[PDB]
């Protein structure tokens, strides 16, 4: 069908714009060094860069988390036109309802980033649509030390601010700016939650 | 087959591009012609005699009017609100359907080449100097 | 030998679309560095290098996990495996090997197509101040040292600024050693 | 800090900061040599004695 | 089915190879007139007239194309009747409100083909600018280019009573809008011939928007008891002017209004002025935000309210390079509180005044927080009075007149 490249380099790219976010905020320009052709580049790596966010001043962390949804915003509002050229039938730009574009996104975006549907969707009829997936793809492979499970959720909480930006981008492709929050919401058998506004 | 103007209109009725592909001609002589036709062709999208249905992945072409011996052809894609209007001169039309589908792939090239530079990931987001002066150096590549 | 085994790994690997993703992702995270610095361009190369380093150092263990390869020593073998079963496995493309030095050291890595600068047009203020695909020098410098070599990589030219090809002139400077498991008694 | 101005030292500054002062010096029209001498003087008086 | 009839109207026009015979196909348009009676089932409706008017518009275009080989002035006197009838038919109870403006401009293009008569396009000058609102980069240039010669040619300066602006103000706004929307190199004759009239007619009450000429800033330095004041670089759009341009930096409690000048002869791009300023307020405080007015008074206040809250914080601090100022010190005192003020004096002499400023009235030279103003004073002594006195504020406004 389409030309394809491998998922394991993309998922590992997708895991680490948060060290890129603290390396863009903290480095406005124990840290290490390397060289190139009569130069140097000062390096700091990911284990010693997400752990500067467990010791983050509160305006610094909230300054970082705008950038993660800004990345998600740019990739979402650039992704929506090519998914329109995929198929995207039977919906409009002003789009007076909301469930027909929540049927769009779980079948049509989240398959093209993660390969499956958002398998639950709950309908508050005044416009708060709950999108629940059970096993989220990039957080399949993260764990803390020997039963220190309390201090890792608050450690790993920047990593869900990419699908804030995705659903901001695919709705600013259809008109406007909205309000978004995230949850964790564990399963019932062998979680994540997003609103709409 | 070779058009005499193309035009792209955004979510609003603000024009993104009103482009002549035979650019600096002997009969330039005004740009008012091929402009007031686009200004009336935005008004012919809420005319009730023609109607664009909302079920399919491939949005459809129409043949809206003819004036000055120039036929217009327009397509509201329904998702990004994009109103795209083209014109041809009258006797370049053959009346057949192979050129009609050639007109449809002229649309499927120009929609593709606009959404490519809508997804050019180095521009600042807006209708700046950059987007129009990239669209012209791609349309000069398409239309000589 | 190799190119059969490269397609053999292209029959049991997880895939997704290279258009409409991943050029979007890399272009979005270079647009952020364009706007984050605030429209300065000789600094984004030295952040994309320092990000590609960290993304290459963890990629090398996945690449040795997929195909069982020994520790490469000469620049016949690294230049063979980079053109045949690293870029073919990870990015579906293959380069070609020209501009070979004296004494088997410094070669070039002309890329035919590029699924990082694919369908990108670069603005006029960065004709002489930006390298676009300079996460690739990050993955090569941070990946070839983890098989205990030591290298240096740099772009020479690019399709976006210049009609000549995208090529990386990788230089062997030295080969690192293995260390003896104590200082002393 | 004048508590050790007469106990084995003099001109030993207390725990203020210098990054905001350097940002204020950069936000004016100060030259590189004058900022070099002023940063050298504040760097010496970050901890000193007399 | 009328669309199907339009397909029939697309049919024979597909099979047309003789333009003298195809005028008989315009007689088929007369048969479409015999369909225009045969489409009517009533007197009036919105959608019925909206479907009815388009075939009459196509017949009007065919009748316009019928005179392609050229009834002396009967066409130019009579086609406006059918055009206004078609516009009245398409003005029936639907939002088709660009047919009305284009049809009115089509009537106005034939009014200008006559003598320069009474205007409707220039009388709706808000609609003339509203064609240029949606950035109409070409239609509104001609819709103002006809109206400029219409208001210039008629030579009676009593304007219409949408707003009675019965002067050269509307034509000056037209000249400014047409010079803004023009090409740069080819608009010298458009610039000079409409910039010459506002020199002689200097009504000169204009508040422009400054899209023609742009501005940019730089760092700020000192001068001989004066401020160099942010040596700006401006762009260019036209031939010349003569403006007493001044910027306006404004802090969180005052407005400096520095970077002034008197004369300017800006003709070249990258104008790169210096804008030397006296009256350096706020002791050259660092929190002076840029209100960024840059009111380049080229015989009209062509301002630009370039406002934000970006906190870029134009600092522009002070310097002491042997210029006359005044200070405050209270040495050689007795056992009660006082103050003193010495000035680095010079030749020219004028006044100063000091005022206390607190939440209560802390200092009191008089019974209230007085002034103690003086002319040509070197050093003196001022007392104080009782409060919870640790550290009060002051403000010593010194109109020194060493400069202007």
């Amino acid at each position: 069908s389409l030309p394809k490249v491998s998922q394991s380099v993309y998922q590992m790219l997708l895991n680490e714009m948060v060290p890129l976010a603290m390396g863009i905020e903290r480095q406005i320009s124990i840290k290490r060094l390397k060289i190139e052709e009569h130069h140097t580049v000062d390096i700091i790596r990911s284990h010693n860069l997400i752990h500067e966010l467990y010791k983050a001043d509160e305006e610094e962390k909230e300054k970082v988390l705008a950038r993660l949804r800004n990345i998600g915003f740019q990739i979402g509002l650039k992704l929506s036109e090519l998914l329109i050229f995929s198929n995207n039938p039977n919906l409009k730009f002003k789009e007076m309802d909301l469930l027909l574009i929540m049927k769009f996104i779980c079948r049509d975006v989240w398959k093209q980033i993660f390969g499956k549907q958002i398998d639950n969707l709950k309908t508050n009829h005044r416009g708060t649509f709950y999108l629940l997936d059970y096993d989220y793809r990039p957080i399949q492979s993260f764990s803390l030390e020997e039963d220190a499970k309390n201090e890792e959720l608050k450690m790993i909480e920047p990593f869900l601010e990419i699908p804030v930006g995705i659903i901001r981008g695919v709705l600013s492709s259809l008109g406007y700016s909205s309000e978004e929050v995230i949850c964790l919401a564990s399963f019932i058998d062998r979680g994540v939650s997003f609103h709409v506004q | 087959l070779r058009p005499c103007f193309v035009s792209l209109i955004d979510e609003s009725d603000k024009p993104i591009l009103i482009y002549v592909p035979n650019e600096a001609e002997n009969e330039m002589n005004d740009v008012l012609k091929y402009n007031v036709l686009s200004n009336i062709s935005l008004d012919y999208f809420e005319s009730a005699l023609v109607e664009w249905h909302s079920l399919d992945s491939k949005p459809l072409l129409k043949s809206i009017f003819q004036l000055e011996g120039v036929s217009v052809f327009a397509m509201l894609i329904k998702q990004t609100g994009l109103k795209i209007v083209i014109g041809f001169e009258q006797k370049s039309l053959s009346g057949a359907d192979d050129e009609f589908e050639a007109i449809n792939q002229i649309f499927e090239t120009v929609r593709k080449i606009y959404i490519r530079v809508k997804c050019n990931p180095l521009l600042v987001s807006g209708d700046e100097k950059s987007i129009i002066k990239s669209l012209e150096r791609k349309f000069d590549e398409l239309f000589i | 030998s190799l190119k059969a085994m490269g397609e053999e790994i292209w029959k049991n690997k997880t895939e997704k679309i290279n258009t409409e993703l991943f050029t979007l992702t890399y272009g979005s995270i270079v647009a952020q560095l364009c706007q984050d610095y605030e429209r300065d361009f000789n600094k984004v190369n030295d952040h994309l290098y320092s990000m590609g380093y960290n993304i290459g150092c963890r990629l090398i263990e996945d690449f040795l996990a997929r195909t069982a390869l020994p520790r490469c020593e000469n620049l016949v073998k690294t230049s063979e495996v980079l053109s045949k079963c690293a870029f073919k496995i990870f990015l579906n493309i293959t380069p070609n090997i020209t501009n070979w030095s004296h004494n088997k050291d410094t070669f070039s890595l002309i890329l035919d197509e590029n699924p990082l600068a694919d369908f990108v047009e670069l603005p006029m203020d960065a004709m002489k101040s930006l390298w676009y695909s300079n996460i690739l020098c990050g993955v090569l410098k941070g990946s070839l040292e983890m098989v205990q070599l030591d290298c240096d990589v740099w772009f020479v030219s690019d399709i976006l600024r210049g009609d000549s090809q995208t090529e990386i002139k990788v230089k062997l400077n030295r080969i690192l050693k293995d260390e003896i498991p104590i200082g002393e008694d | 800090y004048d508590y050790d101005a007469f106990k084995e030292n003099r001109i030993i500054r207390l725990l203020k900061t210098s990054i905001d002062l350097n940002k204020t010096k950069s936000k004016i029209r100060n030259l590189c040599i004058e900022k070099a001498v002023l940063d050298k003087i504040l760097i010496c008086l970050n901890k000193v004695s007399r | 089915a009328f669309q199907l009839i339009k397909n029939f109207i697309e049919s024979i026009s597909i099979e047309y190879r003789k333009s003298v015979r195809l005028l008989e196909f315009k007689h088929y348009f007369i048969t479409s007139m015999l369909s225009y009676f045969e489409f009517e089932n009533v007197s009036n409706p919105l959608l019925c007239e909206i479907k009815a008017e388009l075939l009459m518009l196509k017949r009007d275009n065919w009748v316009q194309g019928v005179m392609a080989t050229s009834e002396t002035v009967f066409q130019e006197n009579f086609l406006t009747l059918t055009k206004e009838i078609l516009s009245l038919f398409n003005k029936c109870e639907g939002k088709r409100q660009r047919i009305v403006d284009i049809l009115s401009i089509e009537i106005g293009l034939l009014y200008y083909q006559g003598k320069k008569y009474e205007e409707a396009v220039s009388l709706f000058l808000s609609c003339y600018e509203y064609y240029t609102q949606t950035n109409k980069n070409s239609i509104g240039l001609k819709i103002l280019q006809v109206f400029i010669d219409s208001l210039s040619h008629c030579p009676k300066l009593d304007v219409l009573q949408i707003d009675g602006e019965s002067v050269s103000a509307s034509a000056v706004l037209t000249n400014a809008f047409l010079n803004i929307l023009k090409l740069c190199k080819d608009n010298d004759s458009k610039e000079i011939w409409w910039k010459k009239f506002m020199d002689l007619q200097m009504k000169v009450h204009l508040a422009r928007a400054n899209v023609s000429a742009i501005e940019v800033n730089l760092k700020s330095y000192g001068f001989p008891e004066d401020i160099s004041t942010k040596t700006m670089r401006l762009s260019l759009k036209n031939m010349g002017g003569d403006v007493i341009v001044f910027g306006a930096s404004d802090f969180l409690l005052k407005k400096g209004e520095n970077k002034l000048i008197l004369e300017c002869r800006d003709i070249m791009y990258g104008e790169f002025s210096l804008l030397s300023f006296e009256i350096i307020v706020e002791g050259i405080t660092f929190v002076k935000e840029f209100p960024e007015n840059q009111d380049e008074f080229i015989v009209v206040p062509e301002i630009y309210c370039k406002e934000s809250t970006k906190v870029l914080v134009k600092q522009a601090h002070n310097l002491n390079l042997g210029e006359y100022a005044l200070e405050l010190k209270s040495v050689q005192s007795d056992a009660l509180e006082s103050l003193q003020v010495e000035v680095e004096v010079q030749k020219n002499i004028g006044n100063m005044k000091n005022l206390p400023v607190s939440f209560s009235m802390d200092e009191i030279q008089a019974r209230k927080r007085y002034n103690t103003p003086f002319e040509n004073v070197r050093l003196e002594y001022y007392l104080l009075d009782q409060i919870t006195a640790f550290d009060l504020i002051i403000k010593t406004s010194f109109t020194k007149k060493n400069d202007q």
Side-chain angles (χ1 to χ4, degrees), chain A residues 1-142 148 150-189 191-197, chain B, chain C, chain D residues 5 36, chain E residues 1 45 52 65 68 94 108 111-112 114 120 136 140 155 164 169 171 176 207 209 213 222 224 240-241 246-248 256 270 283 291 301 316 322 325 335 350 356 366 373 389:
Chain A
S1 297
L2 277 296
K4 293 182 183 292
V5 294
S6 186
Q7 212 271 346
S8 314
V9 71
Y10 180 60
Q11 160 196 333
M12 183 179 72
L13 175 60
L14 190 69
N15 294 340
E16 61 88 22
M17 302 146 268
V18 193
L20 172 68
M22 192 84 108
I24 193 48
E25 172 150 337
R26 179 65 65 192
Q27 180 258 350
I28 61 170
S29 69
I30 180 73
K31 324 312 211 163
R32 303 151 201 61
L33 191 143
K34 64 165 292 302
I35 48 173
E36 68 267 17
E37 274 69 40
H38 187 273
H39 295 285
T40 189
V41 160
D42 292 331
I43 50 175
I44 191 65
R45 66 180 65 88
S46 304
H47 62 58
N48 191 359
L49 209 62
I50 310 175
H51 287 85
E52 275 193 6
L53 188 153
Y54 182 76
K55 291 141 54 208
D57 170 39
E58 199 39 66
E59 64 98 18
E60 183 94 355
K61 178 169 187 163
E62 266 315 294
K63 197 167 296 173
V64 175
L65 299 198
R67 213 159 274 110
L68 277 171
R69 54 176 71 92
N70 170 237
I71 300 299
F73 203 49
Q74 274 299 111
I75 190 167
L77 72 84
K78 276 164 180 299
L79 173 54
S80 169
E81 285 92 15
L82 277 296
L83 300 190
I84 278 161
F85 263 50
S86 80
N87 51 350
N88 190 359
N90 52 33
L91 61 94
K92 277 74 69 177
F93 164 64
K94 181 68 176 177
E95 163 46 27
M96 72 291 291
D97 62 357
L98 282 72
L99 183 62
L100 192 40
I101 62 171
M102 295 299 103
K103 201 58 211 65
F104 159 72
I105 172 172
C106 65
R107 206 163 188 97
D108 291 327
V109 188
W110 185 259
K111 205 185 292 313
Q112 302 313 70
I113 318 176
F114 311 113
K116 56 170 165 49
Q117 287 70 240
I118 305 163
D119 62 358
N120 203 357
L121 167 49
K122 192 49 211 171
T123 318
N124 170 44
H125 280 50
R126 274 84 58 197
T128 306
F129 280 76
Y130 270 68
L131 287 173
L132 282 72
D133 184 328
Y134 283 131
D135 51 52
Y136 178 44
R137 175 72 48 88
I139 321 291
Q140 207 66 32
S141 308
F142 299 137
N150 189 359
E151 68 196 9
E152 62 87 19
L153 278 297
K154 216 166 179 307
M155 187 66 203
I156 193 166
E157 90 175 324
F159 280 14
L160 285 186
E161 318 267 5
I162 295 303
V164 159
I166 301 299
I167 63 171
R168 281 176 181 260
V170 299
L171 292 201
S172 165
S173 71
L174 308 187
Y176 36 81
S177 80
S178 169
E179 170 55 76
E180 266 318 295
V181 285
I182 61 170
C183 319
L184 277 296
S186 74
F187 43 71
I188 62 170
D189 54 334
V192 76
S193 301
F194 324 110
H195 291 51
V196 311
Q197 273 308 115
Chain B
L1 180 53
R2 180 94 81 170
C4 60
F5 80 109
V6 311
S7 66
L8 300 89
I9 318 296
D10 63 358
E11 321 277 2
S12 169
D13 305 315
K14 196 172 198 60
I16 299 304
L17 196 49
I18 317 299
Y19 169 72
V20 297
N22 291 15
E23 282 85 6
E25 295 316 300
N26 44 2
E27 207 169 353
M28 181 166 247
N29 210 23
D30 43 354
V31 165
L32 292 203
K33 63 91 176 179
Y34 324 126
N35 205 294
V36 65
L37 283 72
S38 69
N39 188 31
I40 208 64
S41 185
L42 62 84
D43 270 17
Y44 290 166
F45 270 18
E46 304 320 297
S47 296
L49 188 153
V50 298
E51 202 294 339
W52 301 264
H53 68 100
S54 289
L55 61 83
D56 51 353
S57 311
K58 189 181 201 302
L60 73 164
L61 188 154
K62 267 191 191 267
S63 308
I64 291 303
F65 64 96
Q66 292 102 342
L67 188 153
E68 184 178 1
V70 166
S71 61
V72 303
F73 300 100
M75 27 184 332
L76 187 153
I77 80 170
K78 300 173 284 296
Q79 279 75 50
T80 76
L82 183 139
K83 306 163 216 187
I84 190 166
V85 173
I86 206 170
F88 296 91
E89 62 87 19
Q90 205 62 225
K91 58 99 178 178
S92 279
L93 277 296
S94 85
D97 44 355
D98 52 350
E99 60 86 20
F100 187 82
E101 288 309 287
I103 278 176
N104 207 302
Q105 286 70 61
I106 280 151
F107 289 166
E108 283 273 313
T109 50
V110 296
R111 192 178 167 200
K112 163 70 181 171
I113 192 166
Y114 170 52
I115 63 165
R116 183 60 251 175
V117 66
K118 236 190 180 172
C119 295
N120 189 359
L122 271 163
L123 61 83
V124 296
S125 59
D127 204 349
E128 318 302 316
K129 199 271 174 172
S130 66
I131 177 174
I132 311 194
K133 279 73 176 175
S134 66
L135 271 165
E136 61 86 20
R137 44 181 311 290
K138 284 177 283 301
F139 291 164
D140 291 331
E141 179 187 272
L142 183 58
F143 313 94
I144 69 152
Chain C
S1 159
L2 286 177
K3 203 166 266 184
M5 182 265 317
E7 162 47 10
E8 175 172 291
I9 301 301
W10 265 116
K11 279 300 291 299
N12 50 350
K13 181 67 174 66
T14 180
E15 321 167 344
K16 64 91 177 179
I17 318 292
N18 47 56
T19 195
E20 66 183 1
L21 277 297
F22 184 43
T23 61
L24 267 72
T25 316
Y26 184 69
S28 168
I29 61 186
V30 75
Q32 187 63 248
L33 276 296
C34 176
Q35 75 96 24
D36 224 350
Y37 276 174
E38 292 84 4
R39 263 280 299 101
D40 172 81
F41 287 135
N42 54 339
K43 216 169 302 181
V44 296
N45 313 280
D46 298 345
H47 198 86
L48 284 182
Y49 201 46
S50 159
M51 191 284 258
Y53 204 80
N54 190 179
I55 208 178
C57 289
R58 295 163 163 268
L59 183 62
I60 193 56
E61 316 180 6
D62 206 316
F63 158 70
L64 276 296
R66 293 258 52 88
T67 181
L69 294 184
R71 192 176 309 195
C72 295
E73 291 143 352
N74 49 353
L75 276 296
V76 176
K77 192 41 75 188
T78 44
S79 187
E80 172 93 338
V81 66
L82 278 178
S83 66
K84 290 187 74 179
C85 294
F87 281 135
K88 164 67 162 153
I89 277 171
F90 283 144
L91 288 180
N92 215 20
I93 70 156
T94 187
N96 275 320
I97 313 294
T98 76
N99 268 6
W100 185 259
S101 158
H102 63 87
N103 76 22
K104 301 290 95 176
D105 274 349
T106 62
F107 71 102
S108 66
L109 204 45
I110 49 160
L111 293 161
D112 313 328
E113 77 269 37
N114 195 12
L116 279 171
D118 204 352
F119 292 103
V120 191
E121 191 35 75
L122 194 144
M124 187 66 204
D125 45 352
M127 294 298 103
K128 278 179 178 54
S129 45
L130 187 153
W131 288 114
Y132 189 73
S133 308
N134 191 359
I135 205 178
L136 273 172
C137 289
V139 307
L140 294 175
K141 175 62 159 273
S143 179
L144 288 198
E145 61 86 20
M146 274 305 294
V147 289
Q148 275 266 26
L149 276 75
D150 194 286
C151 295
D152 263 337
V153 297
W154 58 95
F155 270 98
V156 180
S157 79
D158 198 286
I159 300 283
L160 307 160
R161 26 175 284 173
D163 192 77
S164 66
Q165 293 82 17
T166 54
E167 86 280 39
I168 314 171
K169 187 177 158 85
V170 53
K171 161 176 84 80
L172 183 64
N173 62 6
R174 42 186 307 274
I175 286 185
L176 272 154
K177 265 76 64 181
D178 173 339
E179 69 275 16
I180 292 298
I182 194 66
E184 68 153 3
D185 45 354
Chain E
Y111 291 168
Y112 189 83
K136 254 11 206 238
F246 59 94

